[PDB]
Amino acid sequence: QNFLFGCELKADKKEYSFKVEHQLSLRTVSLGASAKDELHVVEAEGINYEGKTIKIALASLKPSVQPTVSLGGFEITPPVILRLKSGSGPVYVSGQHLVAL
Amino acid sequence: SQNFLFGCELKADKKEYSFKVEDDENEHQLSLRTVSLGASAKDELHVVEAEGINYEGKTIKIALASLKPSVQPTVSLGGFEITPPVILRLKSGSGPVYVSGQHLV
Amino acid sequence: SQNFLFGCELKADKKEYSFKVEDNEHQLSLRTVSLGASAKDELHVVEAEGINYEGKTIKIALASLKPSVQPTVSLGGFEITPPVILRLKSGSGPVYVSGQHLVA
Amino acid sequence: RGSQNFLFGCELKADKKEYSFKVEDDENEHQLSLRTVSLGASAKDELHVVEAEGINYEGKTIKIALASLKPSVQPTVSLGGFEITPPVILRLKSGSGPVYVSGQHLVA
Amino acid sequence: SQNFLFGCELKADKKEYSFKVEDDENEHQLSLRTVSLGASAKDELHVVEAEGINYEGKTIKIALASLKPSVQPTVSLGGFEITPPVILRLKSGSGPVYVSGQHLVAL
């Protein structure tokens, strides 16, 4: 089954934690109307193939250059934290929460 | 699997498009492909959002794209499949914005 | 399925391209829209015209491009059922549309 | 996914405008899946256009434009896996290059 | 199949990332998702290349992306799968450049 997913990362609330008791498929990352005209970096933190915790950079966005990046359905296994690493925000992430059996 | 074209135009006097379907004996999905700015759009940031129910039963609004005529007038979503009901809305910016995709049955 | 190249050129003088077939099932999968070297520095809008799920003919905007801002857009395999018209709603062109014609 | 995938790339430039992709009668179905087109560091600031030349479904050779790129506007376009059955020629239709094309050679 | 997060950072200090898998019996792929420029990247073209095997078993270098902070800071590759082993390399520019993606395992 396939549900809408989204989160907002901002100075207030730099992180979103995807957990639960499934797959997230990330679709776009985009800067809100009010973001400072500067580079924003959004990162994902989770476990790699070795079982080590890593931080990976998903996108670098700037309002006057590239305010949206489309990820094409980047599937991630829970758990993952999405975080605004730099830039004012707000930054949005959209995608799907997929459930199977 | 039938595949039909899908589109809508979001503009100042019509900021929403309601994808709802019903009394079908048939499963419906939309797969969004592009969001694009029309010619007369003000050169300012435009934001299009989707409003629908999440995995935990709560209506949410998610941002699909931020576009700007002089910077990035089209964004490709690559087949963002959404289950009905869903509202697409022009959250901010003037000028008309378009969404294109597919309506699968 | 098998896979063959698809393309067309749209410009102010040749604004429309009609995609039709007979036969096998056919689908057109669009991949890129791009602006040609000689296109004017202005917005070019490309649209598709074909049927919606209720049988009514609609027109949908595939892409807005401009040589000095975004000369190409990748559609990522936008599958369309024949027949469809592709049209240059605005802009000088030339604009190119590329993709696959899939046959099964 | 499924069958085997190998890396594919070529470079196109003013003095080397074409790359011809052909597969020998070996056994298997072969696909060339195009992933990216990007401009090299040295490329002049002008539009560069890359086209592909191959078979339509009527068996006739056609030329289609894959991407228009410019260093100071849009130096890379991801094609997301535009599969093409060999043979096909990739050509720098306009501009100086260098241009690179990347992708996968798929074998089943 | 399995899907794990993958990432690496390439910069003038460390221009290469080597993706190998310890021989096992299963199919691994590195599926590349995005390449993006870090906060301190200088404003010049950055070019990331991959070096790996072609269909004839010969090692080739192929350019994946060209990025520049004031024109195009991020490129999505949309799941460009490559069979190990592969080196990813900053073929020019300063970096930092980051690559994200998935390490896929099947069979």
Side-chain angles (χ1 to χ4, degrees), chain A residues 1-100, chain B residues 2-105, chain C, chain D residues 2-108, chain E residues 2-24 26-107:
Chain A
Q1 328 157 68
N2 165 29
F3 300 101
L4 287 190
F5 160 89
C7 67
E8 176 189 59
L9 306 172
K10 58 181 171 342
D12 221 291
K13 207 202 122 261
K14 297 178 155 159
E15 291 185 1
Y16 181 89
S17 153
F18 181 85
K19 279 201 258 55
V20 203
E21 269 157 60
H22 303 205
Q23 198 108 152
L24 211 66
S25 176
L26 312 177
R27 283 278 165 185
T28 67
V29 183
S30 61
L31 299 181
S34 65
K36 192 193 218 222
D37 196 27
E38 65 192 352
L39 180 78
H40 298 249
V41 178
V42 177
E43 69 168 17
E45 174 182 316
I47 61 258
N48 75 359
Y49 172 73
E50 288 82 43
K52 169 163 165 75
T53 299
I54 57 172
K55 301 197 288 295
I56 73 178
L58 292 179
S60 277
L61 298 186
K62 196 162 181 260
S64 64
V65 182
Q66 184 174 21
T68 298
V69 172
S70 174
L71 304 177
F74 187 160
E75 276 162 4
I76 299 180
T77 307
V80 62
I81 293 186
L82 300 183
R83 113 158 33 71
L84 176 67
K85 174 173 177 155
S86 58
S88 70
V91 172
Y92 297 80
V93 187
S94 80
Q96 314 170 218
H97 184 325
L98 292 189
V99 200
Chain B
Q2 283 158 193
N3 169 26
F4 299 100
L5 297 181
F6 166 81
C8 62
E9 171 185 58
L10 305 173
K11 57 199 306 162
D13 58 76
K14 199 188 186 278
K15 290 177 177 192
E16 286 174 18
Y17 178 83
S18 180
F19 167 49
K20 39 157 99 245
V21 59
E22 30 164 280
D23 326 317
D24 246 85
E25 313 95 0
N26 261 349
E27 293 181 347
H28 294 290
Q29 253 197 358
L30 250 35
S31 173
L32 309 181
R33 294 278 165 186
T34 60
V35 181
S36 63
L37 296 179
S40 50
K42 194 184 151 101
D43 188 22
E44 63 189 345
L45 256 193
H46 288 244
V47 171
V48 176
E49 68 173 13
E51 173 183 329
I53 325 308
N54 83 354
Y55 158 71
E56 76 197 298
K58 207 199 167 165
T59 297
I60 68 184
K61 305 160 88 94
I62 70 174
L64 295 176
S66 288
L67 307 200
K68 185 168 189 259
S70 65
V71 172
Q72 180 169 20
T74 302
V75 170
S76 181
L77 313 177
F80 184 153
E81 283 171 324
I82 305 162
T83 290
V86 63
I87 296 167
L88 307 178
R89 112 149 39 79
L90 170 63
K91 175 183 183 157
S92 67
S94 77
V97 180
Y98 301 76
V99 181
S100 69
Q102 306 170 225
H103 179 356
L104 302 199
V105 183
Chain C
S1 76
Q2 305 166 70
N3 179 33
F4 302 93
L5 301 193
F6 168 76
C8 65
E9 182 188 84
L10 309 172
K11 49 175 189 88
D13 326 282
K14 176 235 155 178
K15 284 186 209 201
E16 308 213 341
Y17 179 98
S18 195
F19 186 66
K20 278 179 149 163
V21 295
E22 253 242 44
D23 260 348
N24 295 310
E25 284 173 345
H26 288 277
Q27 165 176 92
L28 176 69
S29 183
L30 308 184
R31 284 279 154 184
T32 64
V33 182
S34 68
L35 293 178
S38 59
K40 199 186 147 245
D41 205 11
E42 64 193 356
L43 211 66
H44 293 248
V45 173
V46 179
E47 77 169 12
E49 178 183 323
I51 293 311
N52 79 0
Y53 75 102
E54 305 167 309
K56 270 196 295 165
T57 286
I58 60 163
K59 302 159 228 219
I60 76 177
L62 297 183
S64 292
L65 309 180
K66 188 180 191 277
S68 61
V69 176
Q70 183 179 195
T72 303
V73 173
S74 184
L75 304 170
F78 190 156
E79 293 193 333
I80 297 182
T81 291
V84 66
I85 295 165
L86 298 168
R87 146 176 337 102
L88 183 56
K89 156 177 207 167
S90 56
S92 85
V95 186
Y96 300 88
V97 179
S98 301
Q100 305 183 37
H101 174 182
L102 305 179
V103 71
Chain D
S3 66
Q4 293 183 66
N5 56 130
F6 296 97
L7 294 185
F8 169 74
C10 63
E11 169 199 75
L12 317 164
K13 39 181 192 150
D15 70 0
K16 207 281 189 187
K17 291 179 190 216
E18 304 180 2
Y19 185 84
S20 160
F21 182 84
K22 311 192 133 297
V23 302
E24 308 190 353
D25 56 57
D26 99 340
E27 242 37 317
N28 299 317
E29 299 200 64
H30 286 242
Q31 293 286 113
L32 169 75
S33 183
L34 296 183
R35 282 278 163 177
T36 74
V37 189
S38 58
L39 294 181
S42 71
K44 282 167 211 277
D45 201 18
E46 49 193 16
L47 202 71
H48 299 244
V49 178
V50 183
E51 97 175 347
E53 188 178 303
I55 289 319
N56 70 11
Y57 86 102
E58 287 169 348
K60 294 182 187 178
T61 303
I62 65 167
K63 300 171 272 182
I64 66 175
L66 303 178
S68 290
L69 308 182
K70 178 170 204 201
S72 68
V73 178
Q74 188 177 11
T76 298
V77 161
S78 178
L79 298 179
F82 185 162
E83 282 174 335
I84 295 179
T85 300
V88 63
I89 298 157
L90 306 178
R91 172 177 304 102
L92 183 61
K93 173 190 187 172
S94 25
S96 86
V99 188
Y100 295 88
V101 184
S102 82
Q104 299 163 143
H105 182 331
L106 301 181
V107 188
Chain E
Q2 296 170 137
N3 165 37
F4 306 91
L5 287 195
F6 171 91
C8 60
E9 158 172 17
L10 310 168
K11 48 188 168 164
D13 238 58
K14 196 194 176 261
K15 296 196 188 197
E16 296 181 10
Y17 181 88
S18 182
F19 182 79
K20 9 224 203 319
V21 175
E22 205 153 335
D23 172 64
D24 40 62
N26 303 309
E27 304 321 323
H28 296 247
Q29 300 283 338
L30 175 61
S31 175
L32 300 179
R33 281 276 166 184
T34 71
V35 188
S36 59
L37 293 181
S40 41
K42 289 185 223 176
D43 196 34
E44 44 184 19
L45 207 83
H46 295 249
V47 173
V48 176
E49 100 178 337
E51 172 180 330
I53 294 306
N54 79 4
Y55 164 71
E56 299 89 23
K58 315 271 181 94
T59 157
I60 57 167
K61 287 165 199 209
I62 69 176
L64 300 163
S66 295
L67 300 180
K68 178 151 207 299
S70 64
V71 182
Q72 183 176 21
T74 299
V75 159
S76 183
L77 311 178
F80 187 157
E81 299 193 16
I82 305 174
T83 303
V86 58
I87 306 173
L88 307 177
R89 173 185 292 121
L90 191 60
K91 155 191 208 207
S92 64
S94 77
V97 173
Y98 292 80
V99 183
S100 79
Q102 306 152 306
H103 183 328
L104 305 177
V105 189
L107 143 94

